[PDB]
UniProtKB/Swiss-Prot annotation:
It is found in: Cytoplasm; Cell membrane; Nucleus; Membrane raft. The modification Phosphoserine is found at S210, S229, S265. It is linked to Defects in Btk are the cause of murine X-linked immunodeficiency (XID). The gene is Btk. This is Tyrosine-protein kinase BTK. Following B-cell receptor (BCR) engagement, translocates to the plasma membrane where it gets phosphorylated at Tyr-157 by LYN and SYK.
């Protein structure tokens, strides 16, 4: 819903992100919130606003809840749930030896649940990666920056050959056909699981983007992480089938995850 800045407070700077500056603050006094001030010239604003209204109506425990926006001024403000531990990539790296495989599988269950809810709303992420996931005060992982890439103006960020495109999270049909689907979000989720169990290593760290794309096209798949059991690897590997229809939905994935977690008890 629209928010009157009268009801917001700026209390601390959290840093500038990929899609504009972000600050920590309080909404209506009692609500811990993270206020993003969108950059200017980066997004198709009207379209972006309408999609913001759609992502505002999305609610789920494992989705960074969106509380509102301030759009009748510029820069647009986006008021979101405050995730105290920041991006999942750095949470993974700072607490590298501070994790047990039970916690890793939990973070994957968290993400998979959020993506199964996004799947059921016919809403695509288009850029699922650890750098777009956040961690709260209790250690739970939640997805964020979902659907943001549909409205980015920089063609480097959007085109298949753009210098900033996340090829290393992209399915073959996204690199070759630009055919984003829930199956491409599933491929990306597979890569994300690999990030988690790798404790935040860059997939295909030393391959150039082109080299990665071609290797993927010819059958290359990420190596089983050291911290991944053969069952976890089987699960993240099923996301990376060459044929899109052969990949399991997020629901079937969540079921497999809970079966393995139960057997990991
Ligand atoms: N909420 C938050 N809490 C805490 N830090 C947050 C954030 C957001 C954020 C704000 C608004 C959002 O708007 C959305 C939400 C969902 C979908 C689309 C847009 C989505 C995310 N960004 N940052 C930080 C910003 C700079 C770098 N960061 C670090 O941690 C540094 C230590 C590495 C993360």
């Amino acid at each position: 819903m629209e928010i009157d800045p009268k009801d917001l407070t700026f209390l601390k700077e959290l840093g500038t992100g990929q899609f504009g500056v972000v600050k920590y603050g309080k909404w209506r006094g009692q609500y811990d919130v993270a206020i993003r001030m969108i950059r200017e010239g980066s997004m198709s604003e009207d379209e972006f606003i309408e999609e913001a209204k759609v992502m505002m109506n999305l609610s789920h425990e494992k989705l960074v809840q969106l509380y509102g926006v301030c759009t009748k001024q510029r820069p647009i403000f986006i008021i979101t749930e405050y995730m105290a531990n920041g991006c999942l990539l750095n949470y993974l790296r700072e607490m590298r030896h501070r994790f047990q495989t039970q916690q890793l599988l939990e973070m994957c269950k968290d993400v998979c649940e959020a993506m199964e809810y996004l799947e059921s709303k016919q809403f695509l992420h288009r850029d699922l990666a650890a750098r777009n996931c956040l961690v709260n005060d209790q250690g739970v992982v939640k997805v964020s920056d979902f659907g943001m890439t549909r409205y980015v103006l920089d063609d480097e960020y959007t085109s298949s050959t753009g210098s900033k495109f996340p090829v290393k999270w992209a399915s073959p049909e996204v690199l070759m056909y630009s055919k984003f689907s829930s199956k491409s979000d599933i491929w990306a989720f597979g890569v994300l699981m690999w990030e988690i169990y790798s404790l935040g290593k860059m997939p295909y760290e030393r391959f150039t983007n082109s080299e990665t794309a071609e290797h993927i096209a010819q059958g290359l798949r990420l190596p089983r992480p050291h911290l991944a059991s053969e069952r976890v690897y089987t699960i993240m590997y099923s996301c990376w089938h060459e044929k899109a229809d052969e990949r399991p939905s997020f629901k079937i994935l969540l079921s497999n995850i809970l079966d393995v977690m139960d057997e990991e008890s």
